[PDB]
Structure formats: structure tokens, C-alpha cells
Design a protein around this ligand. Sequence first.
Ligand SMILES: C[C@]12CC[C@H]3[C@@H](CCC4=CC(=O)CC[C@@]43C)[C@@H]1CC[C@@H]2O
Ligand SMILES: O=C(O)c1cccc(CSCc2ccc(Cl)cc2Cl)c1
Ligand SMILES: O=C(O)c1cccc(CSCc2ccc(Cl)cc2Cl)c1
Length: 249
Amino acid sequence: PIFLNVLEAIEPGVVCAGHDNNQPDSFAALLSSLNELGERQLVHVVKWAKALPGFRNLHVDDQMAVIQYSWMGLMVFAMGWRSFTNVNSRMLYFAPDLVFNEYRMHKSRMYSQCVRMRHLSQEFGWLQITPQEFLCMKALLLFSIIPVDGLKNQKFFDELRMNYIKELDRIIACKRKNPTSCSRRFYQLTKLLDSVQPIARELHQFTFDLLIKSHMVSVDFPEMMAEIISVQVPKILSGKVKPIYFHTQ
Ligand SMILES: C[C@]12CC[C@H]3[C@@H](CCC4=CC(=O)CC[C@@]43C)[C@@H]1CC[C@@H]2O
Ligand SMILES: O=C(O)c1cccc(CSCc2ccc(Cl)cc2Cl)c1
Ligand SMILES: O=C(O)c1cccc(CSCc2ccc(Cl)cc2Cl)c1
């Protein structure tokens, strides 16, 4: 089971937000912390993507590209998994030092999005996602958003992505026999993967808006997040980069 040994080996540990929970909950302080958390998770995402099977087959510019388009979806999905395993999805477990309860949801001014993330989180429970299904789904999220005109080497990207689809099909299928089941299950996992995208997009709009007005509102964006949110998020927002959906929406 080489493919899973690797996914299971390179999975990131806990990342702390650095939030001072002694501060009173405020928009400026909650969002600044979520932003630092994002900066910190990006270092780990980069290191993890580059250790994935087949990832350095991609053109070097394409490597930076797929990471910079898909981090939001990756991080949302993983946070939903954390939330699911650490607090049965009752709260959003951004990090051990930044757990959102209902008060933090309203104060962050992202109540509706948080609610949608909580929903995502509860699906892991509703569908009984195994840890192997989770790891393979999250790997496939690295490959689920690309420019409409293609990458530098799109042919490589297509092959890699096809392979990651087959690995997920394999993880479902090391277990079952009479194949209504395997067929139903693949359908649920692809539907769940698709559902990450509309949420990632709401958060794209949100953080963009907020970067634009950050000075007026005392929210800090660190270097990389400011750069990625000014340079790559708008390509998504302007429709020049789009998610790859399994089913028509
Ligand atoms: C992008 C963002 C900072 C980073 C947040 C993001 C919401 C989802 C999220 C979950 C994580 O586990 C890491 C941080 C991130 C990626 C936030 C929405 C508004 C804020 O600007
Ligand atoms: O280097 C970083 O920490 C960073 C920060 C934000 C976004 C990305 C995407 S780069 C992924 C990558 C691909 C190829 C090479 Cl040579 C080198 C790299 Cl770092 C990387
Ligand atoms: O072990 C695996 O499952 C695995 C998973 C993903 C990718 C790869 C290697 S694919 C990388 C690749 C890139 C371009 C082309 Cl044309 C052809 C290929 Cl085979 C192997």
C-alpha cells in the first residue's frame, strides 16, 4: 500500500495560530490571527505538496500555481476534518489556540461561512469518512483548480490528476464486493469534494474584500497571504482560474 504509506507519512502535524486568547474577541484580532494561521499553514502545505507522489513531474511554475490556487480549499477541508475529530464538529477547530465557538463566529463577521464550514465538517461524520478517504480526498483537492487556458504543461497535470482519482477509487474499493456500494460511495465522495469549492470561493471573496479595506479595519495580513490574495485570488474572482467540478453545478 505504497501510495497511502506516503500520504500517511507526509501529513502535517498540529499548527498553532499564535492567538493570544487573553485578548478580548474582536474582529481585528480574530481575523489577524486567522491570517497568521494561514501564513503558517502555507509553509506546511508547500512542504507537503512537494513530497506528494508525482508532484515534481509538474513544471516548476505549475507547482507554485496549483498550490497558490488551491490552498484555501485544502485548508478548509483539513480544518473540517480537525473539527470533526477533536470536537465532533460542534465548533471550528482552526488550531488548538483558535477554536471558534458561536461568539467567535458572529464577531469574525463570517457567521454564514462558518456555518457552511461546520456543515462541511459534519459531513465527515454523516458519511463516516475513514482517515484513508480523507487523505486521498485532500490530495485531490491540490489538483482541483486551474486556469481556463491551462497550465505550462497541462498534459502532465491531467495524468497526475487522473492517477489521484484512481487512488481514491482504490481506497473506497479495498473493502467491498457487490458494487451498488462502491458506486454509491464514489458518488458521495465526489459530491463532497465538489462541495468544498463554493465555500472556498465565498472565503476567496471575503478575504479579498478584507485585504482591500484592511487598513481601515486594523486587520494584519502577513507577506505571503497579502501577496497571494492580491496576485492570485483575483484570477479566481475574475474567472480566469476555475475549479474542476466532478458533477455539473
Ligand atoms: C483567508 C482567511 C485567513 C486564513 C483562514 C481563512 C478561513 C479558513 C482557514 C482555515 C484554516 O484552518 C487555516 C486558515 C484559513 C485559511 C480566512 C478567511 C478570511 C481570512 O482572511
Ligand atoms: O516558498 C514558499 O514558502 C511559498 C510560498 C507561497 C507559495 C508557494 C508556492 S511555491 C512551490 C514551489 C514549486 C517549485 C519550486 Cl522550485 C519552489 C517552490 Cl517554493 C511557495
Ligand atoms: O503512486 C501513485 O499512485 C501515483 C500517483 C500520482 C502520480 C503518480 C505518477 S504520475 C506523473 C505523470 C506525469 C506526467 C505524465 Cl505524461 C505521466 C505520469 Cl505517470 C503515481
